[PDB]
Amino acid sequence: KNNTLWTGPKPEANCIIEYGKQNPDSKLTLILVKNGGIVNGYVTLMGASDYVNTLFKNKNVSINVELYFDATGHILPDSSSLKTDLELKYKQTADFSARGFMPSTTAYPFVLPNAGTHNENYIFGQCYYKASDGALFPLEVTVMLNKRLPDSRTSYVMTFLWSLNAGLAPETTQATLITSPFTFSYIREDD
């Protein structure tokens, strides 16, 4: 009903993980669905470059995805990891206002760029990486909502961090990186 905002169900490469990289090296699947006063989210990342697909040759990895949105909830692609806007599961007059999908600035305000403050702006959880030999490794997930503005053109922030801190690296060869689906919910802004 104007209630699902997403990347599509099986997006082509649309996201940049590696630094200084100019073109997408990964496929982010992100779905944001309204449910009353919350949004229910679903996110998974799949590697699409040799750099991304050899990260799990190390035992300590960190994958960061940052999404910056304007005042009507559309992605600002220059600064964001995701290079294509999200779309409604149903089509556009003016493309549209996606502000009701954004994290509430009342629940998750923007604050002083002071270190280690306002930990009420984070959601923590876990998802998994299934290695080529089958071993299942937990990935610690951090989602940051709003909190830190990256510049003067952004209205909303949603960032994802997947962390691996294993005793032994999952892989010894290149393998398709796939984070298992992570679900989360947050208090949403008004439409």
Add this chain to the structure above:
Amino acid sequence: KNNTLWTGPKPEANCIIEYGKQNPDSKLTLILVKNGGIVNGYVTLMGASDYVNTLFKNKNVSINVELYFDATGHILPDSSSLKTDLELKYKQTADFSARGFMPSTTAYPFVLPNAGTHNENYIFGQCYYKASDGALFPLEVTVMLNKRLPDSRTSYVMTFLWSLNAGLAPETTQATLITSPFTFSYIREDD
């Protein structure tokens, strides 16, 4: 649609954690949204007293929140930790019936006050506490639905327990206690 029942998105102190305390010492954020035959929940607690905000100076902590509701789903404040009723995201003729937001008494019945029975009335999960030095500690969460009546005036029960069992205390000073958001779902009563 009469589909979101909550505390509001950034409530003032509305909940009592400490024993014998007469006035609120914490801010409970609780959102209950209908989705088909289930309710999707979201809960977070923020400390608002020196007692609450020094609990994590110990390595073994337990925080209990108890919510008792009447037959139309409204909070009974005398016995409950939450001292203000929940409200619909949209306003009141008779205030209203919130029975369809309550935990099903078929799925989660009331039973003999016998110890260690009926563990089908519990939901278990985890959320986190981010310490002032940044260390992230897991908090084991238990939600109890119905099961034990506290008195003869209650129709529905929802209780929350957050447990920390760390090797070393998170804090050595007072710090704002914040439990990271915990989401859960349960089978709901009929409207």
Add this chain to the structure above:
Amino acid sequence: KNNTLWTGPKPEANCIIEYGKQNPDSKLTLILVKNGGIVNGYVTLMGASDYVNTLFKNKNVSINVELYFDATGHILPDSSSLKTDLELKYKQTADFSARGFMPSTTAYPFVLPNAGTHNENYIFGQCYYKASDGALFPLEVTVMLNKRLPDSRTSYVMTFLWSLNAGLAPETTQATLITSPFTFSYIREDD
């Protein structure tokens, strides 16, 4: 709205866990609710046979539930663990099409019966078993969506695996097996 597909809230024995068993030995509670482009799920299993209720006398257990659906989203009971079809929370002309509740074959395709491939078809998580002495044990959960066809009559697959790998068995006697509720979300097929 034709938006909840389930077993009912407190089903009678409807599922077979044990091998070669001809009649139900367990009660599966499964609820699938549409929410925009995803389904939100809720699943719990309760034992209803001495075999099921003594599995946790061992420290290493594995419980598998397999659900195979036809092209309109109805259970194929011969091959499935669940011996009764799911039903809409609201009643039948032709019974009905439940295809919009099924896991997307775009997001979670069917692939080569090659070992250890396509780990994007799995959801991993945890739920718990509360033992008779009260000890709480984590159960690792794997949900497989589509991926492997079991035969030429199936259109959709959803399988559940609960694993216990404890140092010491939870129980030394028979006790009602109950898995605490596990919630999950997946990208759904079109109606």
Add this chain to the structure above:
Amino acid sequence: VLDINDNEPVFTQDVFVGSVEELSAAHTLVMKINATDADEPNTLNSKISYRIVSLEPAYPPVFYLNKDTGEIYTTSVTLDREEHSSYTLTVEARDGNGEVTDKPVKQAQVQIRILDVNDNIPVVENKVLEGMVEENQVNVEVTRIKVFDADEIGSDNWLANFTFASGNEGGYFHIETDAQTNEGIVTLIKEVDYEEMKNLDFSVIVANKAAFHKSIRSKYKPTPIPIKVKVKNVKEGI
């Protein structure tokens, strides 16, 4: 005859004693203290207000004293017997509005004993793990496995307990716990020939005589402890 507040509240006992188990849920009733006031009932002259004067070891606070009822409960702070076994507590009973003044009022003491539970896994201190026997010997001390346990000394929660994991299928060893030193005493119950060169190495699992508390199970993975055994040669002749 009009009442005046001319006698203080006095406790029924100079000392109260109660007990509560470790790791108790919050607000668990431990015990209850009492006092009486002979003045006119249901008037401020007879309203007693129970307060905690001092506590040991004082910090942190794990007991709340309902001033109106005298009931003592456990707080949201968990009790740990290994942290503090016994609490000794001085209470107080006040007249009138229950206002704390510089007036010397009657006071009694409370003694709470914290009950121990098996919530601590045994650990071998034994820093050099190797058995020693001679050829052609029987009923000799192979080694002594020294084990530490934090729980209440003497109790089944502390008493070490052993089981062979592997290596004793031949029935060459017998193990038993020395309850006084908490040592696992393994001894030879069969002669061995040095020349046959049998490998008598074996592994064992440690636990407590009583089961572990539900608080710690599953967090405990029984890991077999290997013990090498060396044999001494002796001049035997032809």
Add this chain to the structure above:
Amino acid sequence: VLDINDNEPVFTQDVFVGSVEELSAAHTLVMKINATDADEPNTLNSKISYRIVSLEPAYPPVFYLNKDTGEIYTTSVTLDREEHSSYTLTVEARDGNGEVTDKPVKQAQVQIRILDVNDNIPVVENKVLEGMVEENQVNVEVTRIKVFDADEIGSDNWLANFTFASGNEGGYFHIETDAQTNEGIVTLIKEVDYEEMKNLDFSVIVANKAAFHKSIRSKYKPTPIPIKVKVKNVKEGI
């Protein structure tokens, strides 16, 4: 000529043998037993019903025998080779409706060998960790690191394996595994001067020659094991 049930079902072999890997998924086909009945086909006189008479070690049950097909599968109960390595099993084949009676029917035996996987991390038993060398020595035994492994003795899943973490950048030590005692043999490959007082302490990491099973990785954090080395002084003169 009308049929009568005048000959029993007989197995194709007095003994069947199969193998299945440890930690196998439920309903994994292990093997299949067979029998034949010479009576009239597709009549109860020829319907065979395969049943398990006895089992070793009997409990718990990890094998289900399809009475109609003779196929043996693995149950929802996981197989653990360290719990039970080999299963020996007596089966049975019955005539008619497959009803268990006091009648003595033909029976064979099945032997299932459980395959070992590396799902157990090595552990140093060596209770006193300190090396010992003299001044001006070369090619001498510094210490022997005794290590235990639960997995199949002799196999690469059991064979200890070593790597220096830190402290051997000077190339003063060499380590190799003694495959017979499973000891890490470290030796001096350089002379040392007691008076120069170099610190030769070092740390090492233990693992298995073969990689660890996917069941246990990530649950294994490579923790370097420190080893202090003491040096002996010798009268050297001017």
Add this chain to the structure above:
Amino acid sequence: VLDINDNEPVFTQDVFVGSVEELSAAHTLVMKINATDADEPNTLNSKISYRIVSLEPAYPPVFYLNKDTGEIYTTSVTLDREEHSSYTLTVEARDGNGEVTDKPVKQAQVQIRILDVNDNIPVVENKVLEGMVEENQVNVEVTRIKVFDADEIGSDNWLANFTFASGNEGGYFHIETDAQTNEGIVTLIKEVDYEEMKNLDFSVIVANKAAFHKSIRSKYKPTPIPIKVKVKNVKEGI
């Protein structure tokens, strides 16, 4: 006068030095290198392109050099000082379109020192844990608890630190860390009588002088280490 590309970009320094802390977040600015080109500004003759020629230990890559700005950042691959303490790096500055050719261009070196954090828990190597004292002795060495720590040797992140858990309520022992060998030195501060047969066993907890990094807390459970103490009898007479 028309420009020609007749002078190469040259670095402001033959060697650059920076530092970054271990476990730093991705894209954290470490430092910045610089060069200059005297040719016509804002033309390809003056456009510098910074590139990494070689690196040590080369693999894996944890530094990205912005070719346009010269800024060096940290990658998504985490830095671990215990893996590699110092990075030495050869850079390069090129003219024109920044195309890598067989032309010999000016190059400088960068030296990044990785800062150590306390992210490694101490571990007792001391393989034989038992104290030893004589009767009627004072100020003697009971035992030396040898402890290993991976973190930067000498630092408070490496320096061992001790606290008695239980067993020293009698005040018979004193412990202090020997900062040179990182041994916990426990000594007698009270005479003991062998005949009275007091049990002087005790337990101790190990940690670092500086607090543990937030990366590792809660993953560290303070487990008391038991230490048995044996006493020697001496002929005392009547």
